[PDB]
């Protein structure tokens, strides 16, 4: 059980994924949204997608 600990197999590799999201349900410890316009912009985007146009 040492070769598996010393080498890696060609083609058997890991990639990296990134994305943007919103986290809700905080107890008043979220963004101020006055210094972060993108939070409100993306919340409005989500609401518009769901059918609400602010």
């Amino acid at each position: 059980e040492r070769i598996r600990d010393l080498t890696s197999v060609q083609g058997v590799r890991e990639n990296s994924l990134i994305g943007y999201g919103l986290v809700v349900g905080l107890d008043g410890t979220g963004d101020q949204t006055t210094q972060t316009p993108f939070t409100t912009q993306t919340l409005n985007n989500m609401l518009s997608q769901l059918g609400i146009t602010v």
Binding site: L22, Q41, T42, L43, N45, Q49
Partner: protein, 58 residues
């Protein structure tokens, strides 16, 4: 079904038939000008009002 739609991404046109708003704001202004000039004035004179005798022949 209209396919996958991102939740937080800004609404952009992605496929054929999608609409987009163009704000036409064009302001173009070009100009050019040039000139050239040249001048030349020349005056010359010589007169012998009173000629002494020894200079008369000349």
């Amino acid at each position: 079904n209209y396919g996958y739609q991102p939740l937080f991404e800004d609404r952009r046109p992605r496929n054929i038939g999608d609409t987009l708003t163009i704000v036409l704001q064009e302001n173009v202004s070009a100009s050019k000008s040039s000139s050239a000039n040249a001048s030349r004035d020349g005056k010359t004179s010589f007169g012998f009002d009173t000629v002494p005798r020894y200079l008369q022949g000349l």
